[PDB]
Nucleic acid binder design. Structure first.
Length: 1287
RNA sequence: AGUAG
């Protein structure tokens, strides 16, 4: 039942009024939005901005710090061990104790060295003992720490400790300051380059010889490992029970020392690890001006650095600095090979590695912002027209504090000026000149991704994300005051626009414009009304609201306005349980809207933690607000699925294929000739062309008026027999017009716990009458109505197309539009005269003299007027194209973060390769390894070479093994316990997963276990080998102990909270277990009943994996804590929680005593037996003989109760064909896999991988490759060599 | 003093 609501009646708007308004609009000179790119223009912009800069910032004489860790090497570096650490610390402290301190930090390190050298023998044993062998002592209360205290610290050291406990810019217009910095970063970079004192066949001659053999001798390659060791030692002395003590470590035969001070643990947010690095002055990361002091010892100088405080983000970023720099250099290597057709020289790759390492070591936010703006500037100076004046003026909205900033500046100033004179792409980071723009843009993008996400000041960004919303809400209120509420809400009409012409502003919309846009979109929709209606009804508006995973998910949500006033922070599942508890029924989406219609919409904002400067916000809304948004979004997603110009409606892999196809039709059009029918039969010849506008929308959601959608929905065709659903959608849009937006508790506390209520914080607190929430109108909040706003933009673009077509019927232009929310691409196909324009100018003059004055806008550069009118018509719908981040170029496009050179894709796969090093699922060794390898395979699919991917895979595997302890020689190492080699142990048991990218991309992510099982089977069955039987016993241990690992996998619960959450004690554990046993169908389908659903959700609240997920503050807390948890008991065995070593011991015990039964063997032999274009890949053959879904059939088999059967039939596309499907399904599993699912306890294990066939793989092939999987595999085979043909 | 601004 759909409720009854009042809709909107048409106002009878005719396109002819808009066409006449456009004729009057285009008859005058219009100021273009973009400035032509000329060398003199860019040079003068830089000069004027340099001159202006110094008068806006206080002058700075002292360059600031940019090196997070300062250290130097003169000999090769061997990895640190415990004995090496002991000997090196002894020697280094003996060295330091002979120095003469002069600064407070020097005195502090002197005292620490004295304390370490005056430790007892028992103290040293307990200091270097393992966890299981450590015995506390008066001084060494923890392993790897000691205990200083007052009376063991000089006054000059207590002064430094109390100082710890308790914007000026550099002259960039100066040549003394701008050359003193280039001579500092060019010796750090010139010291990091000094040499210190089937796929494998191709990798050994190309990548291993020209990249990994050249860099393996540099100072950077060894300082990377030294800093890895230093960061590991810092991570160890950061956990709870340790961070509050002192520590002292030594590296490189005592040449480097690390004095770790007491500091807050990094488990609690907002804490820093404090350390000092005393080293031997030499080549490397040494900035002598930012060292605390330099102490001489006759001949050798020792550099004592400042007390560095590093948070967990930067600390974990410095631990993978070597891997990050190496991956970036390996990507630059491949890009150079593809650009110049030959391998780089030694010096080039060495300098590239040094630059990447320096970037990865200096994890500052100022440099991150500079590199964020550079990737916008570079596209703005290699294009015909752009907004480079604004981008450059923004580049100077920075104080340049460190030498590394005034060096990257000095480089950008030269690069951008050189690029504007050659429109031959000079390199930003080497002395080479590229042949393609993609090489340079990818080179700078890689340097942008060397900085981590979330380097901003935490509270600064918490304020920034609120000020934008408050400012635009105030702007909307001011517009309501000027023109009244009725005009701003219902929108103005054309006759008012003509009389004012200032009504065409943002947050204001024109009724006639939206009605005509809806009619233009109807011109497409009405041709497929049945399809649109069926797609709308396919959204299942009658199904219960809380039986959908998105409505019970783990994502954040808002609750109630607590007594404090703030809006509760909760989870979606918590609110679902709360609603069901106090309800009698499971309400449909529409019936839950009737009970929550009068409850105002509420919202809160949280940080998104982006890599870009000026982090953006994310909105968390209450349950009524979510129901409204789901109604609107279901309606508009169903409608927009059938509009090709809407790109959100694509799955995510189809966006690139669609934009490529659009560009192909554009190019096909351009390969033609236009003929304008001059009087009589004479024809004027015209050459077709194309111009690409990479439009970006300014303040998409903030500067908007959601009311424009209510009219838009009214006129928008859907094909349904009545308007009940349309009226409901209009009503939902009405209910989201006004929102109560709440300040975060963090920001409210900060403002309250303060004394300087300065301006810009007094007009911010006036938005909230009670100081907790304020009313926002018009704005629909970021990300809530994406598919509605994008569809509206598409409609307005189509309206512009129609208006231009009516304006110039004689001409033959070609418009292509792509919209993806605050991102668009416009291809304008215009005509130009051939040879001199003797006839074209005459025709234009005749038309202008005939009364068609608007032809004044097509005399020359049609595309200029095309874009002017398109922009104006878009503004009439309250859409503003960004004059800064929009680029116009006839031979280059940028869309969806992907670069196009007409019809050639270029995707930054570096982001995927570097993301595999961090942000792991953290569900255990097997899951994390399979996730890192999956992310490397994805990079391979996005265009990474089979050799750049093979290096990233090696790095990821090594890092995962080191982070879980399974690499050779550590705790959890299988060889210590198991009797088989590291290469023969199953991966779930710490086995060596070291597998080629070429087979991880085709066979799968978990075939190493399957290959091992096949090898063991063959060996045992052909020779009766005892070791093979041992391997089979390990496999059986994993199978009983049971990313999908069919042969089983250790079950981990890494996180367990101290506090239980709301509505978790409704049903006791015994009752939940009994309910799970009785109702087996509810393991594969969500109950469609209040009682069953409530019990199901309470049970889901008591799932270890869900418990771990709900207690997780970013992946940083995982990669941070795991170093300790590998010792702790985080695995499941015998029904309790034990260590992974205990699991290894149990596996060894069972395998050693394992015997080959007949069923085990039966099951084992049942188990073992050019143009860079984008295409699709398909690894699964057609097995779709099932009409219903897999959950429906699996639940149907176990369906016995009437309620269970009813819940199964509701969750089925074809409830009348379940039984047949099941039978077919059985055959389909017994004819391909040989497993009988009818047997109990068999189908439960097989099911979790029957959930497949949806992996829509998109691969960036070289163009000649067909879409077949075999063709793509052969292309990967042929691409194993970088600079050779290996057919 | 560092991060940050």
């Amino acid at each position: 039942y759909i409720p009854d609501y009042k809709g909107m009646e048409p106002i009878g708007a005719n396109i002819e009024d808009l066409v006449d308004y456009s004729k009057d609009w285009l008859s005058r000179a219009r100021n273009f939005s973009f400035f032509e790119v000329k060398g003199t223009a860019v040079f003068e912009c830089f000069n004027s901005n340099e001159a202006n800069h110094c008068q806006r910032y206080p002058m700075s004489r002292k360059p600031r710090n940019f090196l997070l860790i300062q250290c130097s090497l003169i000999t090769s570096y061997k990895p640190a061990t415990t004995l090496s650490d002991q000997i090196d610390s002894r020697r280094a402290c003996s060295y330091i104790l002979n120095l003469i301190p002069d600064t407070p930090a020097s005195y502090l390190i002197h005292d620490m060295a004295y304390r370490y050298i005056n430790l007892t023998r028992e103290d040293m044993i307990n200091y270097y003992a393992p966890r299981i062998q450590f015995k506390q002592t008066q001084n060494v209360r923890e392993p790897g720490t000691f205990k200083l205290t007052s009376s063991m610290l000089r006054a000059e050291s207590k002064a430094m400790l109390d100082l710890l406990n308790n914007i000026e810019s550099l002259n960039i217009a100066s040549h003394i300051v701008q050359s003193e910095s280039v001579s500092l970063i060019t010796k750090i970079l010139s010291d990091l380059e000094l040499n210190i004192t089937v796929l494998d066949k191709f990798f050994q001659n190309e990548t291993q010889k020209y990249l990994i053999d050249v860099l393996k001798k540099t100072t950077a390659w060894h300082i990377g490992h030294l800093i890895r060791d230093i960061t590991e030692s810092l991570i160890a002395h950061s956990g709870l029970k340790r961070s509050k003590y002192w520590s002292l470590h030594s590296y490189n035969n005592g040449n480097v020392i690390l004095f770790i001070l007491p500091s807050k643990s990094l488990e609690v947010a907002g804490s820093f690890i404090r350390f000092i690095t005393v080293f031997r002055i030499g080549p490397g990361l040494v900035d002598k001006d930012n060292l605390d002091t330099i102490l001489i010892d006759g001949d050798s100088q020792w550099g004592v650095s400042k007390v560095m405080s590093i948070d967990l983000n930067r600390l974990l970023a410095l631990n993978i600095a070597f891997e990050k720099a190496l991956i970036a250099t390996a990507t630059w290597f491949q890009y150079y090979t593809e650009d110049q057709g030959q391998f780089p020289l030694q010096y080039a790759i060495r300098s590239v590695f040094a630059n990447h390492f320096l970037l990865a070591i200096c994890q500052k936010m100022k440099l991150c912002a500079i590199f964020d703006n550079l990737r916008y500037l570079i596209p703005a100076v290699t294009s015909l027209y752009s907004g480079f004046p604004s981008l450059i003026e923004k580049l100077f909205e920075r104080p340049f504090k460190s030498s590394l900033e005034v060096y990257i500046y000095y480089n950008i100033k030269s690069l951008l000026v050189a690029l504007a004179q050659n429109n031959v792409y000079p390199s930003f980071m080497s002395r080479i000149v590229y042949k393609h723009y993609r090489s340079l843009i990818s080179e700078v993008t890689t340097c942008f991704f060397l900085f981590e996400k979330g380097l901003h000041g935490n509270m600064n960004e918490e304020a920034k994300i609120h000020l934008e919303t408050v400012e635009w809400a105030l702007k909307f209120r001011e517009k309501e005051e000027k023109y009244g509420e009725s005009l701003v809400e219902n929108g103005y009409m054309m006759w008012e626009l003509r009389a004012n012409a200032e009504l065409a502003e943002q947050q204001l919309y024109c009724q006639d414009a939206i009605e005509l846009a809806a009619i233009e979109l109807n011109k497409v929709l009405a041709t497929k009304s049945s399809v649109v209606a069926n797609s709308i009804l396919s959204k299942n508006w009658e199904e219960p609201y809380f039986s959908q995973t998105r409505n019970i998910s783990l994502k954040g949500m808002s609750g109630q306005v607590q007594e404090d006033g703030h809006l509760s922070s909760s989870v979606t599942i918590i609110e679902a349980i709360r609603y069901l508890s106090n309800s009698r029924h499971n309400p449909s989406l529409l019936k839950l809207y009737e009970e929550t219609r009068e409850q105002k919409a509420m919202a809160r904002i949280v940080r998104k933690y982006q890599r870009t400067e000026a982090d953006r916000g994310f909105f968390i809304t209450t349950l009524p607000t979510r129901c409204r948004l789901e109604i609107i979004e279901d309606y508009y997603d169903a409608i927009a699925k059938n509009i090709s110009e809407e790109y959100i409606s694509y799955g995510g892999e189809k966006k690139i294929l669609a934009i490529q196809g659009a560009l192909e039709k554009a190019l096909r059009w351009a390969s033609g000739e236009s003929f304008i029918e001059l009087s009589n039969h004479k024809f004027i010849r015209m050459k077709r062309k194309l111009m690409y506008v990479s439009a970006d929308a300014t303040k998409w959601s903030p500067g908007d008026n959601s009311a424009k959608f209510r009219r838009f929905t009214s006129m928008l065709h859907n094909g349904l027999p009545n308007n009940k659903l349309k009226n409901c959608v209009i009503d939902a849009l009405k209910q989201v017009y006004k929102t109560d937006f709440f300040m975060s508790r963090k920001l409210r506390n900060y403002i309250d716990s303060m004394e300087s209520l300065d301006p810009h914080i007094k007009q911010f607190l006036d938005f909230f009458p009670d100081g907790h929430h304020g009313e926002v109108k018009g704005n629909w909040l970021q990300g809530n109505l994406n598919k509605c706003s994008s569809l509206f933009g598409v409609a307005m673009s189509l309206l512009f197309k129609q208006v231009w077509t009516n304006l110039f019927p004689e001409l033959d232009c070609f418009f292509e539009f792509a919209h993806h929310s605050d991102d668009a691409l416009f291809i304008y196909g215009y005509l130009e005269p051939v040879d001199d324009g003797t006839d074209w100018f005459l025709f234009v003059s005749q038309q202008i003299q005939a009364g068609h004055l608007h032809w004044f806008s097509v005399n020359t550069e049609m595309w200029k007027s095309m874009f002017n009118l398109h922009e104006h018509i878009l503004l009439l719908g309250s859409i503003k194209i960004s004059p800064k981040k929009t680029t116009v170029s006839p031979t280059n496009a940028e869309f969806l973060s992907t670069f196009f050179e007409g019809c050639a894709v270029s995707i930054p796969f570096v982001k995927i390769l570097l993301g595999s090093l961090s942000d792991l699922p953290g569900l255990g060794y097997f899951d994390d390894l399979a996730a890192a390898q999956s992310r490397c395979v994805k990079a391979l699919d996005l265009g990474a070479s089979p050799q750049v991917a093979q290096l990233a895979v090696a790095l990821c595997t090594s890092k995962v093994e080191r982070l879980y302890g399974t690499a050779p020689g550590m705790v959890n190492h299988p060889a210590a316990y198991l009797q088989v080699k590291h290469t023969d142990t199953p991966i779930p048991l710490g086995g060596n997963g070291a597998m080629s990218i070429m087979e991880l991309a085709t066979a799968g992510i978990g075939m190493s276990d399957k290959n091992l099982l096949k090898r063991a089977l063959l060996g045992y069955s052909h020779k009766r080998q005892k070791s093979m039987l041992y391997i089979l016993g390990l496999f059986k241990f994993l199978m009983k102990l049971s990313q999908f690992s069919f042969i089983g996998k250790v079950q981990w619960k890494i996180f367990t909270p101290k506090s239980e959450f709301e509505f978790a004690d409704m049903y006791t554990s015994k009752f939940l277990e009994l309910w799970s046993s009785q109702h087996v169908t509810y393991d594969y389908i969500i109950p469609k009943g209040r009682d069953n659903l409530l019990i199901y959700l309470v049970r889901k609240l008591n799932d270890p994996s869900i418990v771990t997920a709900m207690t997780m503050q970013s992946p940083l807390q995982l990669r941070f804590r795991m170093q300790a948890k590998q010792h702790m008991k985080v695995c499941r065995l015998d029904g309790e929680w034990v260590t992974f070593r205990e699991v290894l011991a149990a596996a060894n015990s069972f395998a050693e005593n394992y015997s080959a039964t007949s069923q085990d063997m039966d099951l084992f032999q049942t188990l073992t037996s050019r143009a860079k274009v984008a295409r699709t890949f398909t690894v699964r053959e057609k097995d779709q003989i099932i009409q219903n879904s897999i959950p429906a059939v699996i639940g149907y088999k176990f369906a016995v109760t009437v309620e269970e059967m009813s819940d199964v039939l509701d969750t089925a596309k074809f409830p009348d064909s379940l039984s047949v499907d099941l039978k077919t399904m059985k055959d389909g599993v017994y004819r391909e896999l040989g497993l009988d699912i009818s047997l109990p306890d068999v189908m439960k294990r097989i099911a979790p991988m029957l959930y497949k066939s949806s992996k829509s793989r998109v691969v960036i092939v070289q163009g000649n490759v067909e879409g077949t999987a075999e063709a793509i595999c052969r292309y990967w085979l042929k691409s194993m060599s970088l600079v050779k043909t290996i057919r």
